Amino acid sequence: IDSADDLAKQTKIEYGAVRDGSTMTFFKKSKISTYEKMWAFMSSRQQSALVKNSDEGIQRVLTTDYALLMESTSIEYVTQRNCNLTQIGGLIDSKGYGVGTPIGSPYRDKITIAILQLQEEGKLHMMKEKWWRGNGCP
Amino acid sequence: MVKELIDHRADLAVAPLTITYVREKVIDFSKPFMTLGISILYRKPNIDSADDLAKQTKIEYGAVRDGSTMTFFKKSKISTYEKMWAFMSSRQQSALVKNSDEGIQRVLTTDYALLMESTSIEYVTQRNCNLTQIGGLIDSKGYGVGTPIGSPYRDKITIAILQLQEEGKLHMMKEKWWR
Numbered sequence: 001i002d003s004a005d006d007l008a009k010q011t012k013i014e015y016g017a018v019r020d021g022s023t024m025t026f027f028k029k030s031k032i033s034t035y036e037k038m039w040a041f042m043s044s045r046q047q048s049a050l051v052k053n054s055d056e057g058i059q060r061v062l063t064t065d066y067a068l069l070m071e072s073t074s075i076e077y078v079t080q081r082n083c084n085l086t087q088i089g090g091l092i093d094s095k096g097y098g099v100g101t102p103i104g105s106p107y108r109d110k111i112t113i114a115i116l117q118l119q120e121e122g123k124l125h126m127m128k129e130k131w132w133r134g135n136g137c138p
Numbered sequence: 139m140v141k142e143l144i145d146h147r148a149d150l151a152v153a154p155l156t157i158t159y160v161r162e163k164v165i166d167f168s169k170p171f172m173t174l175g176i177s178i179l180y181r182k183p184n185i186d187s188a189d190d191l192a193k194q195t196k197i198e199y200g201a202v203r204d205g206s207t208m209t210f211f212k213k214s215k216i217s218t219y220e221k222m223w224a225f226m227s228s229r230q231q232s233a234l235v236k237n238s239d240e241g242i243q244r245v246l247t248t249d250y251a252l253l254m255e256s257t258s259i260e261y262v263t264q265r266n267c268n269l270t271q272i273g274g275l276i277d278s279k280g281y282g283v284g285t286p287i288g289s290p291y292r293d294k295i296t297i298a299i300l301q302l303q304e305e306g307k308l309h310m311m312k313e314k315w316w317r
Contacts, residue, residue: 002196003196006194006196008193009193009194030224030228032221032224032228033217033224034221093228093229094229
């Protein structure tokens with residue numbers, strides 16, 4: 001099992017994500033039948049396949065057979081901080097994350113030029129390295 | 139090609155293009171002389187139908203950018219084709235290749251499948267021995283050469299290529315580059 005399709009070949013391992021998740025947003029707004037049927041499964045029994053936060057979901061992952069869907073960086077960090085947990089499957093979907101800005105906000109230009117300065121100077125690589133550092137796993 | 143032919147700024151567009159139902163209303167196609175259809179290519183580590191690949195994504199697959207298979211997939215009503223369409227559209231188009239050579243490199247490095255016209259598949263098969271055409275055609279559709287809509291020269295071109303057709307010159311013509 002290295003993606004959701006062996007969890008589409010068989011469905012008896014209950015799976016879900018965190019409530020108000022962008023993932024489930026994508027599941028419901030996609031017209032792919034496979035991810036729509038994942039949406040159908042997770043909606044069932046009063047939508048108990050959504051969890052109020054990441055931490056209860058990950059600790060249910062430790063004991064119950066819970067296939068949990070989250071973003072990449074958290075998975076990488078938890079794997080670097082725990083070798084008793086190893087991710088399952090590669091990248092199921094790629095989406096970019098931007099900076100939240102009010103609609104009509106006149107602050108767009110200044111923050112845009114500032115982040116252009118950041119990307120041309122490339123300290124973002126340093127801050128990615130600083131916190132997402134790990135020690136691997138044997 | 140399509141916008142140039144609609145604007146009638148290019149007299150001819152001899153790039154090969156299949157005959158589909160939706161682009162017959164903007165340009166004139168020539169009568170098909172070679173049959174074609176969508177087919178799948180498999181890389182070997184040295185699938186049994188479209189439906190089988192429709193129920194798994196463990197093996198990466200794609201299509202050439204801006205083709206007819208994508209539009210066929212969106213316009214179909216059975217689960218296989220729309221699943222193909224949505225997987226093509228998802229992943230932010232990363233399962234698709236902008237050019238055919240990108241798909242070729244994908245096939246060479248890892249197990250990559252393409253949903254494209256058959257003669258490309260058997261072209262790669264005849265020019266690469268680590269792969270072979272899988273099964274037969276899934277559909278059949280026309281073939282033609284891009285010509286301006288309502289262009290009188292189109293009739294003369296069709297007559298000339300037909301006259302080439304009875305003599306069978308194009309058969310051995312395609313054969314000498316089938317070697």
